Amino acid sequence: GIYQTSNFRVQPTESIVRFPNITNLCPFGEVFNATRFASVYAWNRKRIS
């Protein structure tokens, strides 16, 4: 006769991940590589969003 013993599942061998990246990144260069920095009496807060 013929019998159902087990079922094979062909498990995956690797992981693929693909995501979107915006061309503009951030003005950290305008902050860390800035030519001039503010006095400790008038601190420079720049908003990043």
Added chain:
Amino acid sequence: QVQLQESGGGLVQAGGSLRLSCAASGSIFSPNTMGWFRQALGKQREMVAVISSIASTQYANFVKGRFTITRDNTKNTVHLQMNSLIPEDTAVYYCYAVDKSQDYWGQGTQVTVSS
């Protein structure tokens, strides 16, 4: 890039008169406050005078009744009529834009008075 143009100093005999000028460029948002400061070689920044957008003028006791600040609203510039000169006024002066964000300084104007 906020820039302050300072001009009008030099060598003047005792009793003469000069007219310094700072023009402000860049952002310089409307509620601004600008002063002039003094520094002689070996001393600190001495607050000479200050003017705000309110048109009020504040002067120190060092130069009582001698130096004046004049405002130009059209170009938003300032001129300091510096008269009745005395050797104790021998110091390089600098510009101070309070504004609302960081305060930008000038490059300097040499003022010498001696005989």
